Symmetry: D2
Subunit: 123 residues, 4 copies
């Protein structure tokens, strides 16, 4: 079971993706919590040259607000796809820029769980 704040991240990212026109280019929303309690959101920008995932848009949005360290992040796909784990590129960026962060993923029983980013890039 997630913390109350972590649950609100899922709610916020879900509301964000549900709110925008269905799009092939803008198909995932993300929300992150800063250590001060603020929440930052974002949607991906698909492009073959590596347009940012929603998580990276969130990182730049948090940075624009001088948010500092982020503690948890989640991504939610459109059309009711629900929680999506961060992709490998986002794992690398998250580890490198916010090594203390957790990402919300679905556990082996399909239940949301916040996992330390290092555990998502094991040896």
């Amino acid at each position: 079971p997630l913390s109350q704040e972590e649950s609100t991240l899922i709610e916020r990212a879900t509301a964000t993706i549900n709110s925008i026109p269905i799009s092939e280019d803008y198909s995932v929303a993300s929300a992150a919590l800063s250590s001060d309690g603020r929440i930052f959101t974002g949607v991906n920008v698909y492009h073959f040259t590596g347009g940012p995932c929603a998580e990276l848009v969130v990182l730049g949005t948090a940075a624009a607000a001088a948010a500092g360290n982020l503690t948890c992040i989640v991504a939610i796909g459109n059309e009711n796809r629900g929680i999506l784990s961060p992709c490998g590129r986002c794992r690398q960026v998250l580890l490198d820029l916010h090594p203390g962060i957790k990402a919300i993923v679905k556990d082996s029983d399909g239940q949301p769980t916040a996992v330390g980013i290092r555990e998502l890039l094991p040896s």
Copy 2:
């Protein structure tokens, strides 16, 4: 001569980058105008795997607000560097996702000018 709305983008991006701690990871801010007159901002996220430029963070921010078409964009560097012309990657993404967009760049005299994205990427 920049329009009032375009000038506001420079003000906003400048305020954004000047408001955050000096960082090697977060070093450029961008601001874009949507067709309905809203303004969206963002800061870059440097990473060797292709962390997004500030422009791309702006595009995802606008998309999160269902902004639709963006009509003009600018990027401002930290440490009082002023207007930075979008890199080739950004030019391609901008052309592909907002073909009607203009980017604010410095003209030959160092003064702001808004140019069609196609002019930056023939």
Copy 3:
């Protein structure tokens, strides 16, 4: 016009892409000439995180061979599409890593022409 080496690069890139199975992931080939008298090829690797274009594969292939300075490059699309201009990300990488390079693109008449890389990223 068009020099012998420029026409040869087109032939090499064309032969490369036409020699592989039709694929949505591997759909463009590139060839580049080095100042030390070698030609390097590559095919793109499509991925949403920014899998490299054919030109970037060529740059890494030249680098693996200690090729130094690339003087001309071209990309050819699969299914007989012919010359493709380098995308914006490739233009940036080429400018930064091989500023002396020319890229073969189509002119206003649709005929091959070698242009300085800076011409493809005007101010």
Copy 4:
């Protein structure tokens, strides 16, 4: 430990990085094995827009030779760094384009070991 064929990948990538000038742009070599036993190499191309890691250059090099499925890959760093585990971006591209592939990494004792790509991305991103 490693199979004879897997070992040759380390040899080939090590040779490659030790055969180029020391560079901040070109700093890692990689080599992969196809099902037919062919080896394909590559070196990274550093760029802030996401210049490819050595592994991705290997993928495009294999693709140019109609190699088909790759079974194992390794990356070897310059400055005599030895084996480098594929970064998160490379893990995703490798999993997506060659889901059966193994990556050679260092074990707890610093010795080479071949691990399935899926093991390097637990709780995987899959739409």
